[PDB]
Protein backbone atom coordinates (compact mmCIF):
# COMPACT_ATOMS: atom_id res chain seq x y z
CA UNK A 1 0.00 0.00 0.00
CA UNK A 2 0.94 3.67 0.32
CA UNK A 3 2.82 4.96 3.37
CA UNK A 4 3.76 8.48 4.47
CA UNK A 5 6.90 8.73 6.60
CA UNK A 6 8.34 11.65 8.56
CA UNK A 7 11.03 12.36 11.15
CA UNK A 8 10.38 13.96 14.53
CA UNK A 9 12.59 16.88 13.52
CA UNK A 10 10.60 17.82 10.42
CA UNK A 11 7.25 17.20 12.11
CA UNK A 12 8.22 19.40 15.07
CA UNK A 13 9.12 22.17 12.63
CA UNK A 14 5.71 21.94 10.95
CA UNK A 15 4.03 22.14 14.36
CA UNK A 16 6.31 25.06 15.23
CA UNK A 17 5.20 27.01 12.16
CA UNK A 18 1.55 26.11 12.80
CA UNK A 19 1.45 27.23 16.44
CA UNK A 20 3.56 30.38 15.99
CA UNK A 21 1.26 31.42 13.14
CA UNK A 22 -1.09 34.35 13.71
CA UNK A 23 -4.24 32.79 12.27
CA UNK A 24 -4.81 29.88 9.91
CA UNK A 25 -1.79 28.75 7.91
CA UNK A 26 -1.14 27.20 4.49
CA UNK A 27 1.98 25.79 2.86
CA UNK A 28 3.63 23.01 0.87
CA UNK A 29 5.15 19.60 1.60
CA UNK A 30 8.66 18.85 0.35
CA UNK A 31 10.09 15.33 0.17
CA UNK A 32 10.70 12.23 -1.93
CA UNK A 33 8.89 9.00 -2.83
CA UNK A 34 10.51 5.57 -3.07
CA UNK A 35 9.28 2.16 -4.25
CA UNK A 36 10.04 -1.13 -2.51
CA UNK A 37 9.55 -4.72 -3.66
CA UNK A 38 8.27 -7.00 -0.89
CA UNK A 39 3.81 -6.49 -3.74
CA UNK A 40 5.00 -2.98 -4.57
CA UNK A 41 4.72 -0.67 -1.57
CA UNK A 42 5.44 3.05 -1.81
CA UNK A 43 6.94 5.22 0.93
CA UNK A 44 6.50 8.99 0.64
CA UNK A 45 8.94 10.71 2.99
CA UNK A 46 8.32 14.37 3.80
CA UNK A 47 11.62 16.08 4.58
CA UNK A 48 10.62 19.72 5.06
CA UNK A 49 7.76 22.22 4.86
CA UNK A 50 7.43 25.82 3.71
CA UNK A 51 4.74 28.37 4.60
CA UNK A 52 2.95 30.46 1.98
CA UNK A 53 0.11 33.02 2.10
CA UNK A 54 -2.89 31.78 0.09
CA UNK A 55 -3.89 35.37 -0.70
CA UNK A 56 -0.58 35.77 -2.54
CA UNK A 57 -1.42 32.92 -4.93
CA UNK A 58 -4.85 34.02 -6.15
CA UNK A 59 -5.91 36.16 -9.11
CA UNK A 60 -10.99 30.19 -5.32
CA UNK A 61 -8.89 30.02 -8.49
CA UNK A 62 -5.17 29.37 -7.99
CA UNK A 63 -2.76 31.56 -9.96
CA UNK A 64 -0.32 29.03 -11.44
CA UNK A 65 1.94 31.81 -12.74
CA UNK A 66 2.26 33.42 -9.31
CA UNK A 67 2.62 29.96 -7.77
CA UNK A 68 5.71 29.24 -9.88
CA UNK A 69 7.33 32.51 -8.82
CA UNK A 70 7.11 31.43 -5.18
CA UNK A 71 8.37 27.84 -5.17
CA UNK A 72 11.01 28.59 -7.83
CA UNK A 73 13.39 25.67 -8.42
CA UNK A 74 12.04 23.77 -5.41
CA UNK A 75 9.00 22.76 -7.47
CA UNK A 76 10.65 19.43 -8.27
CA UNK A 77 10.56 18.36 -4.62
CA UNK A 78 7.01 19.42 -3.75
CA UNK A 79 5.08 16.28 -2.81
CA UNK A 80 2.00 17.92 -1.32
CA UNK A 81 0.55 20.80 0.68
CA UNK A 82 -0.74 21.43 4.20
CA UNK A 83 -3.57 23.42 5.75
CA UNK A 84 -3.63 24.46 9.41
CA UNK A 85 -6.86 25.53 11.11
CA UNK A 86 -6.40 26.73 14.69
CA UNK A 87 -9.95 26.52 16.04
CA UNK A 88 -12.29 23.53 15.61
CA UNK A 89 -11.28 19.91 16.11
CA UNK A 90 -12.77 18.34 12.98
CA UNK A 91 -10.43 16.71 10.48
CA UNK A 92 -12.72 16.58 7.46
CA UNK A 93 -12.00 17.86 3.95
CA UNK A 94 -14.02 20.89 2.83
CA UNK A 95 -14.86 21.92 -0.74
CA UNK A 96 -12.07 24.49 -0.98
CA UNK A 97 -9.59 21.91 0.30
CA UNK A 98 -10.61 19.51 -2.47
CA UNK A 99 -10.42 22.26 -5.10
CA UNK A 100 -7.01 23.33 -3.79
CA UNK A 101 -5.71 19.76 -3.72
CA UNK A 102 -6.80 19.32 -7.34
CA UNK A 103 -5.04 22.41 -8.70
CA UNK A 104 -1.90 21.78 -6.65
CA UNK A 105 -1.74 18.13 -7.71
CA UNK A 106 -2.14 19.25 -11.32
CA UNK A 107 0.48 22.01 -11.23
CA UNK A 108 3.27 19.96 -9.64
CA UNK A 109 2.53 16.82 -11.67
CA UNK A 110 5.06 16.24 -14.43
CA UNK A 111 8.09 14.28 -15.62
CA UNK A 112 10.39 16.04 -13.14
CA UNK A 113 7.72 16.64 -10.52
CA UNK A 114 5.79 14.06 -8.51
CA UNK A 115 3.10 11.56 -9.48
CA UNK A 116 -0.35 13.17 -9.43
CA UNK A 117 -1.94 10.09 -7.86
CA UNK A 118 0.37 10.40 -4.86
CA UNK A 119 -0.03 14.11 -4.16
CA UNK A 120 -0.61 14.74 -0.45
CA UNK A 121 -3.02 16.90 1.52
CA UNK A 122 -2.15 17.36 5.19
CA UNK A 123 -4.92 18.57 7.49
CA UNK A 124 -3.86 20.00 10.86
CA UNK A 125 -5.82 21.51 13.75
CA UNK A 126 -5.20 22.75 17.29
CA UNK A 127 -8.16 22.95 19.68
CA UNK A 128 -8.21 23.69 23.41
CA UNK A 129 -10.59 22.83 26.25
CA UNK A 130 -12.02 25.01 29.02
CA UNK A 131 -9.36 26.60 31.27
CA UNK A 132 -7.00 25.96 28.31
CA UNK A 133 -4.61 23.68 30.19
CA UNK A 134 -4.91 20.81 27.73
CA UNK A 135 -3.96 21.48 24.10
CA UNK A 136 -5.07 19.04 21.40
CA UNK A 137 -3.32 18.55 18.06
CA UNK A 138 -4.80 16.26 15.42
CA UNK A 139 -3.49 15.60 11.91
CA UNK A 140 -4.04 13.29 8.93
CA UNK A 141 -2.69 12.67 5.42
CA UNK A 142 -5.06 12.29 2.46
CA UNK A 143 -4.88 11.38 -1.23
CA UNK A 144 -7.21 11.40 -4.23
CA UNK A 145 -8.08 7.81 -5.15
CA UNK A 146 -9.15 6.43 -8.55
CA UNK A 147 -12.81 6.31 -7.52
CA UNK A 148 -12.69 10.09 -7.09
CA UNK A 149 -12.90 9.92 -3.30
CA UNK A 150 -10.26 11.10 -0.83
CA UNK A 151 -8.81 8.51 1.55
CA UNK A 152 -6.69 8.70 4.74
CA UNK A 153 -3.09 7.49 4.44
CA UNK A 154 -1.08 5.78 7.18
CA UNK A 155 1.53 8.10 8.69
CA UNK A 156 4.70 6.60 10.16
CA UNK A 157 6.83 8.80 12.40
CA UNK A 158 10.31 7.28 12.11
CA UNK A 159 11.81 7.06 15.59
CA UNK A 160 14.31 5.10 17.70
CA UNK A 161 11.81 2.45 18.74
CA UNK A 162 10.40 1.79 15.28
CA UNK A 163 10.58 3.05 11.70
CA UNK A 164 9.22 2.29 8.22
CA UNK A 165 12.44 0.57 7.14
CA UNK A 166 11.58 -2.36 9.41
CA UNK A 167 8.94 -4.24 7.43
CA UNK A 168 13.77 -8.57 9.38
CA UNK A 169 15.86 -5.60 10.58
CA UNK A 170 17.52 -5.35 7.15
CA UNK A 171 17.22 -2.18 5.07
CA UNK A 172 15.74 -3.22 1.71
CA UNK A 173 17.18 -1.54 -1.40
CA UNK A 174 14.72 0.76 -3.21
CA UNK A 175 14.28 0.89 -6.99
CA UNK A 176 16.71 3.31 -8.63
CA UNK A 177 20.59 15.17 -6.46
CA UNK A 178 22.97 14.67 -3.49
CA UNK A 179 21.83 16.31 -0.25
CA UNK A 180 24.10 18.09 2.22
CA UNK A 181 24.48 14.87 4.21
CA UNK A 182 25.44 12.51 1.37
CA UNK A 183 28.02 15.07 0.25
CA UNK A 184 29.41 14.90 3.79
CA UNK A 185 29.62 11.10 3.60
CA UNK A 186 31.51 11.33 0.31
CA UNK A 187 33.76 14.06 1.73
CA UNK A 188 35.29 11.65 4.25
CA UNK A 189 36.43 9.30 1.47
CA UNK A 190 35.62 6.12 3.39
CA UNK A 191 32.40 -1.06 9.80
CA UNK A 192 32.61 0.56 13.22
CA UNK A 193 35.37 2.99 12.23
CA UNK A 194 33.22 4.30 9.39
CA UNK A 195 30.27 4.78 11.74
CA UNK A 196 32.27 6.79 14.27
CA UNK A 197 33.63 9.12 11.59
CA UNK A 198 30.10 9.81 10.35
CA UNK A 199 28.65 10.86 13.71
CA UNK A 200 31.69 13.05 14.38
CA UNK A 201 31.54 14.80 11.00
CA UNK A 202 27.77 15.15 11.30
CA UNK A 203 27.92 16.78 14.74
CA UNK A 204 30.51 19.37 13.72
CA UNK A 205 28.54 20.22 10.58
CA UNK A 206 25.38 20.40 12.70
CA UNK A 207 26.84 22.97 15.10
CA UNK A 208 28.09 25.06 12.17
CA UNK A 209 24.54 25.36 10.82
CA UNK A 210 23.22 26.86 14.06
CA UNK A 211 24.58 30.37 13.45
CA UNK A 212 23.52 30.07 9.80
CA UNK A 213 19.95 29.26 10.83
CA UNK A 214 19.72 32.24 13.20
CA UNK A 215 20.78 34.75 10.54
CA UNK A 216 18.24 33.37 8.07
CA UNK A 217 15.44 33.53 10.64
CA UNK A 218 16.24 37.12 11.59
CA UNK A 219 16.38 38.18 7.94
CA UNK A 220 13.06 36.62 6.94
CA UNK A 221 11.42 37.90 10.14
CA UNK A 222 12.59 41.46 9.49
CA UNK A 223 11.31 41.31 5.91
CA UNK A 224 8.04 39.67 6.99
CA UNK A 225 7.53 42.61 9.34
CA UNK A 226 8.31 45.34 6.81
CA UNK A 227 5.94 43.85 4.24
CA UNK A 228 3.12 43.44 6.76
CA UNK A 229 3.51 46.98 8.12
CA UNK A 230 3.70 48.46 4.61
CA UNK A 231 0.55 46.72 3.37
CA UNK A 232 -1.20 48.04 6.47
CA UNK A 233 -0.04 51.56 5.56
CA UNK A 234 -1.20 51.40 1.94
CA UNK A 235 -4.52 49.89 3.02
CA UNK A 236 -5.27 52.85 5.29
CA UNK A 237 -4.10 55.32 2.64
CA UNK A 238 -6.21 53.87 -0.18
CA UNK A 239 -9.20 53.69 2.16
CA UNK A 240 -8.99 57.48 2.43
CA UNK A 241 -8.01 58.07 -1.20
Amino acid sequence: DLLVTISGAALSLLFFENVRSVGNQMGFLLGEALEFIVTVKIHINVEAIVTCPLADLLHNHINKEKLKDFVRDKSKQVIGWFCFRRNTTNLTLTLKDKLLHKQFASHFSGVNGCKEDFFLTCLLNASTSETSGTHKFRHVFLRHNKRGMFEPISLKINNLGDDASRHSDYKPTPVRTPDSFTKLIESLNLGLDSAMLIQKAAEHHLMSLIPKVCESDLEVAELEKQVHELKIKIATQQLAK
Binding site: A10, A48, K136, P152, L160, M207, L223
Partner: protein, 239 residues
Protein backbone atom coordinates in the same frame (compact mmCIF):
# COMPACT_ATOMS: atom_id res chain seq x y z
CA UNK B 1 0.84 29.03 39.90
CA UNK B 2 -1.83 30.94 37.98
CA UNK B 3 -0.89 30.51 34.31
CA UNK B 4 1.88 29.16 32.07
CA UNK B 5 3.25 30.83 28.94
CA UNK B 6 5.36 28.49 26.81
CA UNK B 7 7.42 29.80 23.89
CA UNK B 8 6.85 28.07 20.54
CA UNK B 9 10.54 27.33 19.97
CA UNK B 10 10.73 25.66 23.38
CA UNK B 11 7.49 23.84 22.55
CA UNK B 12 9.21 22.55 19.41
CA UNK B 13 12.21 21.16 21.32
CA UNK B 14 9.97 19.34 23.79
CA UNK B 15 7.81 17.82 21.04
CA UNK B 16 10.87 16.91 18.97
CA UNK B 17 12.25 15.16 22.05
CA UNK B 18 8.99 13.27 22.56
CA UNK B 19 9.00 12.17 18.91
CA UNK B 20 12.45 10.63 19.33
CA UNK B 21 11.35 7.30 20.81
CA UNK B 22 8.17 5.22 20.82
CA UNK B 23 8.85 2.57 23.45
CA UNK B 24 10.15 4.79 26.25
CA UNK B 25 9.05 7.86 28.20
CA UNK B 26 11.43 10.75 27.52
CA UNK B 27 12.08 13.49 30.09
CA UNK B 28 13.55 16.95 30.63
CA UNK B 29 13.38 20.21 32.59
CA UNK B 30 11.81 23.62 31.95
CA UNK B 31 13.62 26.92 32.49
CA UNK B 32 12.29 30.48 32.50
CA UNK B 33 11.00 33.24 34.78
CA UNK B 34 8.10 33.52 37.22
CA UNK B 35 6.17 36.79 37.43
CA UNK B 36 2.71 37.76 38.70
CA UNK B 37 1.32 34.23 38.84
CA UNK B 38 2.49 33.54 35.29
CA UNK B 39 5.49 31.41 34.32
CA UNK B 40 7.38 32.63 31.25
CA UNK B 41 9.08 29.46 30.01
CA UNK B 42 11.94 30.41 27.69
CA UNK B 43 14.45 27.56 27.91
CA UNK B 44 14.65 23.76 27.98
CA UNK B 45 17.05 21.05 29.15
CA UNK B 46 17.01 17.64 27.47
CA UNK B 47 17.76 15.06 30.17
CA UNK B 48 19.20 11.56 29.89
CA UNK B 49 17.44 8.62 31.55
CA UNK B 50 15.61 3.81 34.04
CA UNK B 51 13.75 1.73 31.45
CA UNK B 52 10.72 1.39 33.73
CA UNK B 53 7.92 3.95 33.99
CA UNK B 54 9.71 5.94 36.69
CA UNK B 55 18.12 12.97 39.79
CA UNK B 56 20.55 15.17 41.72
CA UNK B 57 23.26 15.55 39.07
CA UNK B 58 20.63 16.39 36.43
CA UNK B 59 19.17 19.19 38.55
CA UNK B 60 22.72 20.45 39.10
CA UNK B 61 23.47 20.80 35.38
CA UNK B 62 20.07 22.42 34.84
CA UNK B 63 20.54 24.97 37.62
CA UNK B 64 24.03 25.71 36.32
CA UNK B 65 22.67 26.31 32.82
CA UNK B 66 19.90 28.53 34.19
CA UNK B 67 22.56 30.59 35.96
CA UNK B 68 24.53 30.87 32.71
CA UNK B 69 21.41 32.14 30.94
CA UNK B 70 21.10 34.87 33.57
CA UNK B 71 24.56 36.19 32.69
CA UNK B 72 24.06 36.05 28.92
CA UNK B 73 20.40 37.07 28.57
CA UNK B 74 20.49 39.33 31.64
CA UNK B 75 17.18 37.92 32.90
CA UNK B 76 16.18 35.86 35.96
CA UNK B 77 16.38 32.40 34.39
CA UNK B 78 15.73 29.44 36.68
CA UNK B 79 14.27 25.93 36.65
CA UNK B 80 10.53 26.54 36.38
CA UNK B 81 9.25 23.02 35.77
CA UNK B 82 9.64 19.66 34.06
CA UNK B 83 8.29 17.75 31.06
CA UNK B 84 7.92 14.08 30.14
CA UNK B 85 6.31 12.19 27.26
CA UNK B 86 3.52 9.61 27.14
CA UNK B 87 3.89 7.32 24.10
CA UNK B 88 0.85 5.13 23.34
CA UNK B 89 -0.63 6.46 26.59
CA UNK B 90 -3.26 9.07 27.49
CA UNK B 91 -1.98 12.54 28.40
CA UNK B 92 -3.56 12.23 31.85
CA UNK B 93 -0.93 12.22 34.64
CA UNK B 94 -0.51 8.82 36.31
CA UNK B 95 -0.19 8.12 40.04
CA UNK B 96 3.58 8.66 39.90
CA UNK B 97 3.22 11.86 37.87
CA UNK B 98 1.24 13.56 40.64
CA UNK B 99 3.52 12.06 43.30
CA UNK B 100 6.78 13.34 41.79
CA UNK B 101 5.15 16.69 41.04
CA UNK B 102 3.96 17.00 44.65
CA UNK B 103 7.46 16.62 46.09
CA UNK B 104 8.81 19.19 43.62
CA UNK B 105 6.23 21.79 44.69
CA UNK B 106 7.51 21.52 48.26
CA UNK B 107 11.02 22.51 47.18
CA UNK B 108 9.76 25.15 44.75
CA UNK B 109 6.18 26.43 44.86
CA UNK B 110 4.30 26.93 41.58
CA UNK B 111 6.29 24.12 39.95
CA UNK B 112 4.76 23.26 36.57
CA UNK B 113 4.57 19.84 34.92
CA UNK B 114 4.10 19.27 31.19
CA UNK B 115 3.05 16.05 29.47
CA UNK B 116 3.40 15.30 25.75
CA UNK B 117 1.26 12.33 24.73
CA UNK B 118 2.36 11.07 21.32
CA UNK B 119 2.16 8.10 18.94
CA UNK B 120 -1.59 7.46 19.00
CA UNK B 121 -3.02 6.72 15.55
CA UNK B 122 -6.66 5.74 15.05
CA UNK B 123 -7.11 2.48 13.16
CA UNK B 124 -9.04 2.66 9.87
CA UNK B 125 -8.95 6.46 10.07
CA UNK B 126 -5.21 7.19 10.06
CA UNK B 127 -5.62 10.20 12.36
CA UNK B 128 -2.84 11.06 14.82
CA UNK B 129 -3.36 12.80 18.16
CA UNK B 130 -0.86 14.82 20.19
CA UNK B 131 -1.90 16.32 23.53
CA UNK B 132 -0.07 18.88 25.64
CA UNK B 133 -1.23 18.88 29.26
CA UNK B 134 -0.16 21.50 31.79
CA UNK B 135 -0.74 20.09 35.27
CA UNK B 136 -0.05 20.51 38.98
CA UNK B 137 -0.82 18.49 42.10
CA UNK B 138 -2.70 19.49 45.25
CA UNK B 139 -4.16 16.41 46.94
CA UNK B 140 -4.92 14.36 42.10
CA UNK B 141 -3.98 16.18 38.90
CA UNK B 142 -5.10 19.80 38.48
CA UNK B 143 -5.20 21.66 35.17
CA UNK B 144 -3.25 24.92 34.80
CA UNK B 145 -4.08 27.32 31.92
CA UNK B 146 -1.50 27.13 29.13
CA UNK B 147 -0.73 29.54 26.29
CA UNK B 148 1.90 28.95 23.61
CA UNK B 149 3.55 32.31 22.91
CA UNK B 150 4.60 33.12 19.33
CA UNK B 151 8.31 33.40 18.51
CA UNK B 152 9.71 35.17 15.42
CA UNK B 153 12.49 32.58 15.29
CA UNK B 154 14.09 29.59 16.99
CA UNK B 155 16.46 30.54 19.82
CA UNK B 156 20.19 29.85 19.63
CA UNK B 157 19.82 27.87 22.86
CA UNK B 158 16.81 25.93 21.56
CA UNK B 159 18.66 24.95 18.39
CA UNK B 160 21.59 23.77 20.52
CA UNK B 161 19.24 21.87 22.83
CA UNK B 162 17.97 19.92 19.82
CA UNK B 163 21.57 18.97 19.04
CA UNK B 164 22.07 17.77 22.62
CA UNK B 165 19.76 14.79 22.06
CA UNK B 166 22.04 13.33 19.39
CA UNK B 167 25.06 13.89 21.64
CA UNK B 168 23.40 12.27 24.65
CA UNK B 169 22.30 9.17 22.75
CA UNK B 170 25.81 8.67 21.37
CA UNK B 171 27.39 9.23 24.80
CA UNK B 172 24.96 6.72 26.28
CA UNK B 173 26.16 4.23 23.67
CA UNK B 174 29.85 4.85 24.41
CA UNK B 175 29.31 4.25 28.13
CA UNK B 176 27.76 0.87 27.31
CA UNK B 177 30.45 -0.03 24.78
CA UNK B 178 33.24 0.92 27.20
CA UNK B 179 31.67 -1.26 29.90
CA UNK B 180 32.63 -4.33 27.85
CA UNK B 181 35.55 -3.06 25.76
CA UNK B 182 38.16 -5.83 26.01
CA UNK B 183 36.35 -9.16 25.77
CA UNK B 184 38.47 -12.35 25.88
CA UNK B 185 35.89 -14.08 23.68
CA UNK B 186 36.39 -13.22 20.01
CA UNK B 187 32.77 -14.03 19.12
CA UNK B 188 31.59 -11.62 21.82
CA UNK B 189 34.06 -8.99 20.63
CA UNK B 190 32.75 -9.17 17.06
CA UNK B 191 29.22 -9.13 18.46
CA UNK B 192 29.67 -6.04 20.64
CA UNK B 193 31.33 -4.10 17.82
CA UNK B 194 28.45 -5.05 15.53
CA UNK B 195 25.91 -3.94 18.13
CA UNK B 196 27.77 -0.65 18.60
CA UNK B 197 28.01 -0.14 14.83
CA UNK B 198 24.28 -0.68 14.26
CA UNK B 199 23.47 1.61 17.19
CA UNK B 200 25.56 4.55 15.97
CA UNK B 201 24.13 4.33 12.46
CA UNK B 202 20.68 4.10 14.05
CA UNK B 203 21.08 7.35 16.00
CA UNK B 204 22.49 9.10 12.92
CA UNK B 205 19.73 7.90 10.58
CA UNK B 206 16.92 8.74 13.00
CA UNK B 207 18.05 11.88 14.85
CA UNK B 208 21.27 13.39 13.50
CA UNK B 209 20.71 13.22 9.73
CA UNK B 210 17.11 14.49 9.80
CA UNK B 211 18.20 17.31 12.11
CA UNK B 212 20.87 18.30 9.59
CA UNK B 213 18.29 18.21 6.80
CA UNK B 214 15.79 20.16 8.90
CA UNK B 215 18.34 22.90 9.58
CA UNK B 216 19.79 22.93 6.06
CA UNK B 217 16.45 23.06 4.24
CA UNK B 218 15.12 25.65 6.70
CA UNK B 219 17.87 28.03 5.62
CA UNK B 220 17.11 27.21 1.99
CA UNK B 221 13.37 27.74 2.47
CA UNK B 222 13.86 30.91 4.51
CA UNK B 223 15.80 32.59 1.70
CA UNK B 224 13.19 31.36 -0.76
CA UNK B 225 10.55 33.18 1.27
CA UNK B 226 12.93 36.10 1.87
CA UNK B 227 13.43 36.70 -1.86
CA UNK B 228 9.66 36.53 -2.31
CA UNK B 229 9.23 39.27 0.30
CA UNK B 230 11.87 41.43 -1.41
CA UNK B 231 9.97 41.52 -4.70
CA UNK B 232 6.77 42.44 -2.86
CA UNK B 233 8.51 45.08 -0.73
CA UNK B 234 10.02 46.65 -3.85
CA UNK B 235 6.61 47.03 -5.48
CA UNK B 236 4.96 48.34 -2.31
CA UNK B 237 7.69 50.97 -1.91
CA UNK B 238 7.10 52.17 -5.47
CA UNK B 239 3.37 52.38 -4.79
Amino acid sequence: LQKVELQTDVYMVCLQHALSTENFEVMGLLIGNFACGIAKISAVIILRRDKKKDSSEQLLKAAAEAERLTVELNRPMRVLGWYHSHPHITVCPSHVDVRTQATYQTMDHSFVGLIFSVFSEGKESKEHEIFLNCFQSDNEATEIPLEIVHTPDISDRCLRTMTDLSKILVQEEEDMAEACKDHPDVLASIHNNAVRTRALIHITDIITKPLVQTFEKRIALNKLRATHLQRQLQELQKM
